[PDB]
Every structure is written in C-alpha cells, then in structure tokens.
C-alpha cells in the first residue's frame, strides 16, 4: 500500500489525515488513503491536493464514502446501508472544527441531528418527528442541559418552583426568560440557585 516513504500526509478538517501518492499512479492519477474508525478507505483522484473521494466497506457490509473539498476546507462522511443507496448517516465537518451530523431512520428522515460548534460544545436532537419537534440536549464544558425541540425555537430548562428556561431559535438568537464561548456559570448542580 502507501506508507511513510511513498506518500505525503495531509491534515484535513475534523482531525482526519490522508496520504497522497508521490508522483502519479499507474494509469494517470494520484492515490489517496485515509483510515476512519478502524476502517481504511481507498480513493483515486487527480489534483494531488488531498481532495477527492475515498470509499470503503465495513465488516457489516455497510459502505463508507469520504469526500474532501477542493480547497480542503470541508469534509463529508456518508455511511450507507448494504445497497449503497440508503443513507444511514451524513457528517459535514468544516475547517473551523464545526460540524453537522444527520442520522436517518428507516424511512429516510432525519431522526437525530448533532450540531458541533467550533468550541466543542454540541447540540443534540433525538426523536425528531415529521412535525419538526423532538428532544433537545446541549452538551457543555462540564454539564449537560436537557429540553425540548420545536420547529420554532429550542427550549432548554433546569428544575422548587424556580424553573427558568433557555431559548435558541432557527437563527442564532439566544434569549433567557450570556457567554459567547457558551457558558460566570460553572457546572450542573450549580444552576438551580440564582
């Protein structure tokens, strides 16, 4: 295959790395190699950039596809079922370390959706329905908040009768009925006081 002497390592968004052929392959192009979660993916392409498409198959016959944008600022990882056509998951990582990951149900609807900000905090949506509603959970540096999702806004709440909420809408609004690095406040138990 490709190793330390016959390739060059290229850093990709999402802390992935890809190896590229030295000069050129047998029939014109450059060869690409990237290992993602125990599974190494093979791909051919021109450009010698690190950009291109790499594919692979898991032990459970699931198909994996990894496309790297031309400017190398975006990464798309798709997992398909055995038919290579039913989408199981699709994750798009950006150069600024932010990402969106969609998980599809057996009908082809987004049933779970994870949004990772550049700071590392995550916004997780589970049990999404065709209504546009579901469960909402914000993962923070230290604690977890749990709440509900509506097609309108996102409400997160911590609970005596002193139980106040946290609202994030379609856009980047954040109203409270706050920090830019998303938090002074500290950890989970300590929210109930103020």
């Amino acid at each position, epitope marked *: 295959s490709l190793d330390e002497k016959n390739s060059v390592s290229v850093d990709l968004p999402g802390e992935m790395k890809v190896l590229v052929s030295k000069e050129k392959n047998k029939d014109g192009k450059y060869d690409l190699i990237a290992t993602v979660d125990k599974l190494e993916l093979k791909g051919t392409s021109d450009k010698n950039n690190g950009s291109g498409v790499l594919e692979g198959v898991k032990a459970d016959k699931s198909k994996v596809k990894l496309t790297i944008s031309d400017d190398l600022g975006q990464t798309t990882l798709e997992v398909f079922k055995e038919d290579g*056509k*039913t*989408l199981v998951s*699709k994750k798009v990582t950006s150069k600024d370390k932010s990402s969106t990951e*969609e998980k*599809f149900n*057996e*009908k*082809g*609807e*987004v049933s779970e959706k994870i949004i990772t900000r550049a700071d590392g905090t995550r916004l997780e949506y589970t049990g999404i329905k065709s209504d546009g509603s579901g469960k909402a959970k914000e993962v923070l540096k230290g604690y977890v908040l749990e709440g509900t999702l509506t097609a309108e806004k996102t409400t997160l709440v911590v609970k005596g009768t002193v139980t106040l909420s946290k609202n994030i809408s379609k856009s980047g609004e954040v109203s409270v009925e706050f920090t830019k690095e998303n938090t002074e406040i500290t950890k989970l138990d300590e929210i109930k006081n103020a």
Partner: antibody
Amino acid sequence: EVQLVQSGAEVKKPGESLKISCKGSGYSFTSYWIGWVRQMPGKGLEWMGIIYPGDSDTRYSPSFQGQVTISADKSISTAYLQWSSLKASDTAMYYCARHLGIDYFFGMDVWGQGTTVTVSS
Amino acid sequence: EIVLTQSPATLSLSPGERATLSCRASQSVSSYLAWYQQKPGQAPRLLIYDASTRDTGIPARFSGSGSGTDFTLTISSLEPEDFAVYYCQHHSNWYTFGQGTKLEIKR
C-alpha cells in the same frame, strides 16, 4: 432482478373510478418509498406522491393532494394509484418508481414500464 | 418556490461530440440533484444522483458535476443511443422535475 411491473393499459369514461397497480420484485418492498409519476401526452414528468408500504405513510405533492389516493398492500408488495371520478384531463402515462430518501434525495432509481390511461366519453 | 431551469431546450449535436447539459436553480440548493434519460416509448432511466455519483450500470461517458446554483450533465462523447430527452430533479419543491432538454441530431 430488481423490478416494478405495472398493470395494463386502461380505456375509461369520465366519472368512472379506476385503480391501477404496481408490483415489486427482487427487494424488500416495505423498506422503500414507492412514488407515482405522471407524463401527459407530449409533456415532461410530474412527481405526484409517495407511500411507504411498511406503514402506509403517504406524502402527496400539493399539486395532486386531494386529486388521487395512493395506497399499498404490504402483504403482496403492491402499490396502487386510484381515482374516484376520472377526468378527460387525467389522460396520461403513469409510472411508479422507487423513491430514495425524504430529508435526503438520491432520485428515483427503479421504474415500472408505465401504464397508459385514456379517459374519453 | 425554488425553480429549476434546464438549458438549452434543444441541444443539437452528432455522435462523437461532447455534450453538456445545464440545470440551474433560482437559489443555492443542496447536492440532491438527479439526472434522467428518457427515449421515446420508454420509461425514464436514472443516470446521476447526488449531483455527481453514477447509478449502477450507467456507462462511464456520463458524468455529473456542480453545486449551489449550477449543475451540469456531461456526455464525454455521444453514441447514437444517447439521443433522447434528459430531465433533472431536485429535492426541493416536493421533488419537482425540470422541464427537460431534448438532445437531437444536428444535420
């Protein structure tokens, strides 16, 4: 070996009801959406709607909502397209096709051979 | 609504030549664009989905590219059986098909 076979050509009169059928072979019929597509004589293709035969979840295009009923018999891998009162303007070719994805979309990858419906007095 | 526009309405070429077909969307849209071929008296056949991946059995001379607003179907060198109507279809607007491009023989 993956295929969809539609019922034969129909010559009907206006007002009559009609139910045409689409049978799947070679794959898990209840694991995929089945869609219906219209092509009027000399015209392009029109997406009408889809059904998930696993639980008969049905989604219609706003252009065809209330004009047709799409149904499915999960136990014999058959989807159906029906009218209760045919119009002359319903004269067209109708295709069923396997529809890939709701919140993603990979196109319609398997097609029936089509069914001609002629509606005349 | 998001509207698809295929250009040109009629593309007149000959076997051996390169063919480029355009689909443009009135707004920036996702990659979920599919291309179909339909010959007279036949059912449509899927050629490309997700803008750039070829369906099973489709010959290598067909390829798709594009993003945002501009999408292209390219036929590297036309064969006689490639002369047909071509349709695009996107996820938006309830999976609406484009109006179609007729690829005819130039004489």
